[PDB]
Amino acid sequence: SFESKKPMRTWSHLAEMRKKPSEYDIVSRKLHYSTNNPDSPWELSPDSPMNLWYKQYRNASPLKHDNWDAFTDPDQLVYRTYNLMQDGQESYVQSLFDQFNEREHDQMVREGWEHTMARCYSPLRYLFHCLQMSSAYVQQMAPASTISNCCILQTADSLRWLTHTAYRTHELSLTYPDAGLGEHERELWEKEPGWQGLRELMEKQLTAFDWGEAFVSLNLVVKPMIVESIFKPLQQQAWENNDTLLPLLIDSQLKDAERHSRWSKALVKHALENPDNHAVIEGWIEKWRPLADRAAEAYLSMLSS
Amino acid sequence: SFESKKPMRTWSHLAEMRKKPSEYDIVSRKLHYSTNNPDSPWELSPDSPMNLWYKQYRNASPLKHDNWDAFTDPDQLVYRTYNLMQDGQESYVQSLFDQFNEREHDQMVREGWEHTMARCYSPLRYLFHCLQMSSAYVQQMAPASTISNCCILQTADSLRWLTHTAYRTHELSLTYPDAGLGEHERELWEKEPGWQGLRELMEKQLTAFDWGEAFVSLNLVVKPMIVESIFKPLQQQAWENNDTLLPLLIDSQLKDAERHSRWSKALVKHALENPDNHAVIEGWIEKWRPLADRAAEAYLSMLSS
Amino acid sequence: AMHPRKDWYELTRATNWTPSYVTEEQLFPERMSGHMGIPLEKWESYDEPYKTSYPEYVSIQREKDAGAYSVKAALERAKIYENSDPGWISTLKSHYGAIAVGEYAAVTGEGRMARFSKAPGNRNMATFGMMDELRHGQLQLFFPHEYCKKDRQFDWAWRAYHSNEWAAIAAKHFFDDIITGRDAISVAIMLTFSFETGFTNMQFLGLAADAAEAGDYTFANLISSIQTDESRHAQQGGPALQLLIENGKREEAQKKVDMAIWRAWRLFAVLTGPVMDYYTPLEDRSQSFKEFMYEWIIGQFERSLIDLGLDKPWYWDLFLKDIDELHHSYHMGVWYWRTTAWWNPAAGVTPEERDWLEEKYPGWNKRWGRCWDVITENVLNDRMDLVSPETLPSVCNMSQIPLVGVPGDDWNIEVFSLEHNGRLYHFGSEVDRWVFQQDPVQYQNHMNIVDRFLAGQIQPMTLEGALKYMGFQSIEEMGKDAHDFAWADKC
Amino acid sequence: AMHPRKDWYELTRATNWTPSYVTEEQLFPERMSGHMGIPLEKWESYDEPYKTSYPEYVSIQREKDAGAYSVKAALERAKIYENSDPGWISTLKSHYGAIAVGEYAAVTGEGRMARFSKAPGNRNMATFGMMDELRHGQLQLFFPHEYCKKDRQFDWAWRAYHSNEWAAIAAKHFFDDIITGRDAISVAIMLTFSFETGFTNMQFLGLAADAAEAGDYTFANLISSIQTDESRHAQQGGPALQLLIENGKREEAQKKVDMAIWRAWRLFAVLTGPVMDYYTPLEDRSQSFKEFMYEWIIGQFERSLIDLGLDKPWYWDLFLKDIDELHHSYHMGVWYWRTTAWWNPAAGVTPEERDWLEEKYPGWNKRWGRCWDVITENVLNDRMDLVSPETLPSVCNMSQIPLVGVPGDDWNIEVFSLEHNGRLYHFGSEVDRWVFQQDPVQYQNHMNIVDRFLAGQIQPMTLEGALKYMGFQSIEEMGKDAHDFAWADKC
Amino acid sequence: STLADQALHNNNVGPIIRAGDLVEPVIETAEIDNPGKEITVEDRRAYVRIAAEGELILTRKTLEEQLGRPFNMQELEINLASFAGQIQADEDQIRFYFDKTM
Amino acid sequence: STLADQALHNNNVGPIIRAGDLVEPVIETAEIDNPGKEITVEDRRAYVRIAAEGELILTRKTLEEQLGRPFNMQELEINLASFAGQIQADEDQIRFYFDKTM
Amino acid sequence: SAFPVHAAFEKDFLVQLVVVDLNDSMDQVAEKVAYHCVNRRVAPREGVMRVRKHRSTELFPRDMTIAESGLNPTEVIDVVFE
Amino acid sequence: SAFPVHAAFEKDFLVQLVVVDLNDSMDQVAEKVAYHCVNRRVAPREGVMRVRKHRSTELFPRDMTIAESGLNPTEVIDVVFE
Ligand SMILES: [Fe+3]
Ligand SMILES: [Fe+3]
Ligand SMILES: [Fe+3]
Ligand SMILES: [Fe+3]
């Protein structure tokens, strides 16, 4: 039978929290209803194509936890506060672009630097769009909305970096119209050996459909390699070629990247509450590391010559 | 007798404008009721002390126009849009401070630079507060609210620069605690010869009570000298001493300064509709120029040695 | 200086390349991508007509939210919850329950495109679309959350998609079919074109007009702000349809639009119809449900569909008749079975309202009016047992909504049935049966709530057993007449 | 990393120095500065208790305005102008007329400090104060501006300070005396301490409460946002008073506070009193004018004054009696001479209101009620000539407001007169005469409107000649009863 | 389907502006930037439906002048709740239009 | 002056919060950060008068926890429409207080 | 021998699940449907109620049982007046 | 010989500008003040109206003129009942 019960101060699922629920809790937690029915993620035939896909690539993942939904973004970002934060950071970057343009920064880079940018920087737009696609995939497959929310914002950050690169490629080409800036990046991504490790890495990562393996390979192998092997060496090369804008822009992008590493590590910490997950995660890191290392090595020998 | 008249689409004083009034027009124009009654600016005894002051230092100024109120800020700024603009610029500057601090920028300036900053930069806080006081004076005495609004925002900008200087003085002192940063600026402003031209200049300018002479001496003599003789030489010195933050900060302050020059010039253009005002303005510029030149010369020989 | 977006926009979507270490098909599998065999190079002509870029996006969306939250904050003491007509409060409750977590599901339709569309401009506009639906999911959880402490039915803003309540099943069956359960190109066409340039304008602008009349500006300001995002990301679908038509796939495109519009229609008729013609107080009804339909779906949406080179759907005349009829019957079902709803349906049949209904739908009193005559007589005579049901409606195997017809003087009702794979299915229209036949693997083993009741899954097999199954956790949560029958006094 | 404000704040106000090329007195002349001979070094201990810094200011004020304008924009169609009680519309009109350009004048009191205060923290906090009053002047021109097209009386939001209308003279005589017409330290004490921690809370928060009850959230949200700035820049006055007391100037400080509070009181009694007890619809009256007085001025303001080491003013008991009495009489004067106001006074004396008035002010019906009995009888008997005046009130030479007393059964009225320099002046209280005697050079040759009428300056010397002199430009602009006497029907 | 036929066979295009500070400026802009076209306006309080036949242009420069404050074309999105017609938008204007004539 | 005497002789201090999203978080914060003091609240719809005897502290950390979103102490100004008591404010808290006891 | 049917009653607005019995006459089935209809949403009236397969033209005889009828469970029936 | 006075009428709520004549009796002055008061804000009554300097205890005689009174222009008078 049905009893009488009083109104609750928050959602019925938070109503046993000790602390007063935050904005983050209220709008982010336990929103994937597709994990409720293990036989029918989606309200359709149990063997519909997308039901099979999710039962295979989410529910059946070797990476297992009995309460994914208790995962918490260490940054507790919501849409509102992401836009406040990134409007501040992106307004700062746009102001840098405006001011460094006024100062005709690009005319004073070391002789030849435009050629190094056209080879090693402007085709990053492909790489970053791969991050973007791949983040969107972890979003749609992750088994808790608090995980997926982190991926959504990471997907937006990828597009942010993509757009920086597009903007600067075009701007650089105005001072240097005879380096193929804005013209030859697809040929470079497809045929230049320094790009082929990365391109092989992402094409294979983009076809890893298990949500766990997708997350591990993207966030724990590929993206840390980009930070150490692409972002930071590029800042150093800029330093030696009198490009003082690139280091500042890359320090803004590194804030984003550090934030991705933060939620990633927090998700690892949550998954490792289950002891089996150590061998699962470590297995996938070993699987993907040699591609990542190969990618890095080819990129740096292209950059450093 | 009294006729019937229809509602107007805007204030009765704008209602003959051809164009639809703007936000700027609506909230800025013709708000000084103290110019309506030439015998009694203020609603008090006609010979009250402040009535005498205004009749002497505003109404009786040699700088004359029959319609001061038709003056227009070329930038058409209102409080709302000033805060949007300066929140963007000041957020950018604060982000620069944060990032350059992270990078330990101050530890890499050329040997001795902290001593040059402590002599030639940190006492600017006195100079800029003089600008602040002086702007507030032109505000309260100017004979049209659209002129006064420009002064108010200029007064805020002065305080903005003052606060930059305070912030950086304190921050620099953390890396360089034995240069007297934050300790000896008043003694420097009062006793160091490189500061005495400027200090003589502002003390005499702050006692020019005629609104016209106040405006001309502040905006057409002193502030252009600061741009050419203080702001720009400091950027050049920073360049030669590996201070890459100071040039960026000063480029933000120069935006403010260019904006002051813009409304100033527009006010000159408006006043010169009256032919007598040419000799008045030019007379005051000749009167104040030698102080300004002396100030500049002493500052630069202190800076360049 | 800054360079204008036109000068660098092309580089932002110059992101297609020719795969070499995997095949194109592996990277864009058809079951997720739905490219219909159209090669990568043809997709590069896709040109989103409503562009944005990342720095503009974060700036503008910051401003949108600033205004939405400010207005909520400034009007918290306006006493909407206490001073509004209870039919208006019920409209809020169904809206938030039927939409909030469905918005958050839509993140996944946009993510499907961001990853699996072969059109590069689509993948970027989908990335903003992901972000937009995230906003919409968070807004429509945050806004109703302050009412939790007033009324447990507001807990269904969060709870409804987690339940097996009949209307939540209808909503999830629809959204999982058009948003989360198909390939990227199907989402472009069925969600962003068909649903989001068609019907969402009804719920989010037509309803806003009623909210503004009802003096609820927090809600009107919220939902019209939401629809400004939709107006941008809905423009992903046109350019996909145009491309499909240019590459020989007009027929497939047309079938997907026809199916999505019908599916959307049946769900909006059961949620938005009763709201607009019955729950919203008479003097707040900006237009009737049918008038709004003719403005938004016939006048605006259908004209856009024709402009893009598609045809009026084959069922157009059925549709037009349905606009005159279906929601009056759906209202009646929701109201008679109110105890299975998480809001409080208003009957909306005081004599004044019935005069309005008759003006907006001539012949109403001799049809639905005949039913409401009996009900109203039982209420006046305090025969309240005759006003609560003692069995279940039969339910559509497509829309998940009860099977209805026109009652009274010219009674007509029709069920369209189908045997398939050794099972008997029932549908509430020719079109719903056709939708099933278009893709039987999507639907065949799905069980509607009545199928479940008869198969032993709902225990005990009683109305109470069903209310428990549907997720109700206290007596207060089940729907009641909005005015506790006070309307009978007006009769 | 950023460094916290505490670590660098002191350098922002380390801006005093010892003048050498001019004297200290030349740089801070006493007539503009009002330092009373206290040397620069003593002023460096000034410590503003409510600090801000430039980057925080622009950020936070951006956010304040974003919310004010958003709310205005979201509620433009709420029909306040058409659906509000006309007494509420009149309250808006007097508020904007009596305040908007007075806010902009206050920029000049803050500029007086920014330039001429010897306290460095005062000069910076005044610079933010300048900016704040700029905001307040622009808001309260921008908000009423959309109503110009509805009603010429809204033109007085801009026009009033440019006119010689009697109430605009009263307002300007007050603001020019305490804000624009004295030295910097007088402004600190009379404006930021006495007026802006005392009385502005009544107009801008007490009235907000009534506005929120009246369902006008645009206005309530506006004016409470304005008062958040005041709460910061009003904190310039305490620290100045403390310094004056520490340096032997307690008596001078006390006289300035006593004078400013009385002057503020008479003007607020004629503008805010009638609003709160008569124009605001009965059911929107959060508290009576006297109740609000006891909350804000007695309970909050006077307690702060005592905490800072000052005394209750010498006239305290007169003041308390005045709270019970004055505004009822001022209401009557404004309403009987309504044709000289730019708003439409509501009489506020329907039997229901008179019961309320009697509860809030026992003995009211045997006093002011006696006057309203005659007026109401003339209205019922359509003797409308007996409801319009045919002469001028006598007016105070300090407050510029008519000379009034208690009418009816225990009639008492008193004028306090003074000969000075061969002229006869009249004042409406002991305190107003005392204020004049405190600084005769500020007032002596000022002529109130009635002085002007008798001296030949208003031509023709007729009521119509006076309405023209006061600036009225069409028949629509002059005040009328707010309800066109419809209240008589309730009697 | 007479009522429906007649509703379908329109060539109306133009913005649907949500309630707020953009409604009157856009109406005024629609009139100024499409001279010799009739602009129709249907006011539904929460939004306003603004239309012309076949094409309706809003230029940034006119909209800025009618709004009375600095205005970037992309900002129209804050108040553009829907629109009829296909859209083409740039930094200088937005055009609502149809390819066919029904 | 009995009514007036009694109104004057109070030692009430604390914030007056304008209507909005800060009212309940501040009330809750006043209670948590001043344990064993009674907090009084007078609701006037456009604002709320929150008080305690002699001293009332609001800490940023508690206010952030009650508001449920990141919060800097200076932001309280957006909603601090007035206050009783002298104020001392820093990055960590705001204290309302009186020097005397009446 | 519970036997579910889906039943549309004349002049009513919907189809409803009604559980009849395998041995039930068409007269008894028509009663059991009427129970959930007449005097709830449908006004009573004189006449004989009859049972047909949905949209049929043939009435089942009054005495025939659902068992003798060849109806399958969950098929749709109409309840109508002669 | 217009002669302005400021006059407070008994039971009224304010003081008003009334312009009397230099040769006017105190009876005629009391009429001219009553004009702007009685039946406007003050109920009529039986009795004789009298004129005194404001707050005075001495009444001016009824026949005395303002001229014979020594009042100055713009001085305040009360109009009162015996
Ligand atoms: Fe959405
Ligand atoms: Fe959407
Ligand atoms: Fe102010
Ligand atoms: Fe103020």
XYZ file of N, CA and C in Angstrom, chain C residues 332-333 335-339 370-391 485 487, chain G residues 12-14 16 31 33-44:
144
model
N -8.914 13.522 -21.983
C -9.885 12.715 -21.246
C -9.216 11.485 -20.563
N -8.325 10.791 -21.271
C -7.618 9.582 -20.759
C -6.695 9.930 -19.615
N -6.950 12.615 -17.768
C -7.755 13.085 -16.639
C -8.489 11.900 -15.938
N -9.071 10.979 -16.688
C -9.799 9.858 -16.027
C -8.841 8.907 -15.258
N -7.631 8.703 -15.806
C -6.581 7.893 -15.181
C -5.580 8.836 -14.432
N -6.070 9.989 -13.926
C -5.151 11.025 -13.320
C -4.259 10.421 -12.254
N -4.761 9.410 -11.545
C -3.976 8.782 -10.474
C -2.629 8.133 -10.968
N -20.261 14.897 -24.555
C -21.162 13.821 -24.095
C -20.581 13.040 -22.921
N -19.278 12.748 -22.979
C -18.535 12.108 -21.878
C -18.459 12.983 -20.612
N -18.155 14.242 -20.828
C -18.018 15.160 -19.722
C -19.354 15.466 -19.068
N -20.453 15.274 -19.791
C -21.805 15.388 -19.195
C -22.038 14.311 -18.105
N -21.686 13.086 -18.431
C -21.792 11.968 -17.465
C -20.880 12.183 -16.272
N -19.604 12.498 -16.523
C -18.635 12.674 -15.454
C -19.096 13.762 -14.550
N -19.486 14.894 -15.143
C -19.858 16.065 -14.365
C -21.072 15.775 -13.500
N -22.027 15.030 -14.054
C -23.217 14.588 -13.290
C -22.833 13.674 -12.114
N -21.843 12.798 -12.310
C -21.437 11.947 -11.185
C -20.804 12.806 -10.091
N -19.977 13.798 -10.480
C -19.356 14.689 -9.484
C -20.416 15.496 -8.722
N -21.407 15.999 -9.440
C -22.399 16.817 -8.752
C -23.151 15.935 -7.783
N -23.290 14.658 -8.115
C -24.129 13.771 -7.267
C -23.276 12.953 -6.299
N -22.041 13.411 -6.153
C -21.039 12.756 -5.325
C -21.082 11.238 -5.538
N -21.046 10.827 -6.799
C -20.726 9.440 -7.094
C -19.281 9.330 -7.535
N -18.359 9.414 -6.595
C -16.928 9.577 -6.941
C -16.334 8.257 -7.407
N -16.966 7.127 -7.061
C -16.456 5.859 -7.625
C -16.566 5.765 -9.151
N -17.524 6.464 -9.742
C -17.721 6.424 -11.191
C -16.701 7.357 -11.922
N -15.794 7.961 -11.148
C -14.879 8.994 -11.676
C -13.431 8.546 -11.551
N -13.283 7.339 -11.039
C -12.011 6.646 -10.966
C -12.067 5.338 -11.692
N -10.998 4.968 -12.385
C -11.172 3.761 -13.188
C -10.846 2.514 -12.407
N -11.310 1.391 -12.933
C -11.068 0.091 -12.352
C -10.518 -0.849 -13.360
N -9.895 -0.343 -14.420
C -9.164 -1.235 -15.293
C -8.092 -0.410 -15.996
N -12.168 19.139 -7.936
C -13.577 19.129 -8.401
C -14.350 20.427 -8.140
N -14.546 22.815 -9.895
C -15.132 23.244 -11.158
C -16.602 22.821 -11.304
N -18.209 5.784 -26.272
C -17.097 5.990 -25.386
C -15.947 6.594 -26.235
N -14.885 7.057 -25.582
C -13.769 7.662 -26.289
C -12.516 6.800 -26.389
N -12.502 5.629 -25.747
C -11.322 4.791 -25.854
C -11.587 3.278 -25.921
N -10.450 -0.258 -24.012
C -10.007 -0.629 -22.687
C -9.725 -2.092 -22.586
N -22.052 -6.996 -20.679
C -22.145 -6.506 -19.305
C -20.762 -6.050 -18.712
N -18.024 -5.203 -20.083
C -17.425 -4.063 -20.728
C -18.208 -2.840 -20.235
N -19.565 -2.904 -20.352
C -20.440 -1.814 -19.882
C -20.101 -1.324 -18.459
N -19.682 -2.272 -17.612
C -19.282 -1.958 -16.267
C -18.241 -0.817 -16.215
N -17.379 -0.776 -17.216
C -16.273 0.131 -17.155
C -16.586 1.363 -18.005
N -17.853 1.569 -18.342
C -18.213 2.555 -19.369
C -19.507 3.299 -19.107
N -20.580 2.517 -19.017
C -21.882 3.087 -18.897
C -21.959 3.742 -17.517
N -22.384 5.003 -17.533
C -22.552 5.817 -16.293
C -21.192 6.298 -15.764
N -20.143 6.108 -16.568
C -18.841 6.659 -16.296
C -18.566 7.677 -17.353
N -18.567 7.210 -18.619
C -18.326 8.176 -19.714
C -19.410 8.130 -20.781
N -20.377 7.223 -20.596
C -21.374 6.885 -21.573
C -22.737 6.766 -20.930
N -23.699 7.518 -21.473
C -25.045 7.603 -20.857
C -25.864 6.330 -21.037
N -26.629 5.933 -20.012
C -27.334 4.662 -20.207
C -28.408 4.826 -21.275
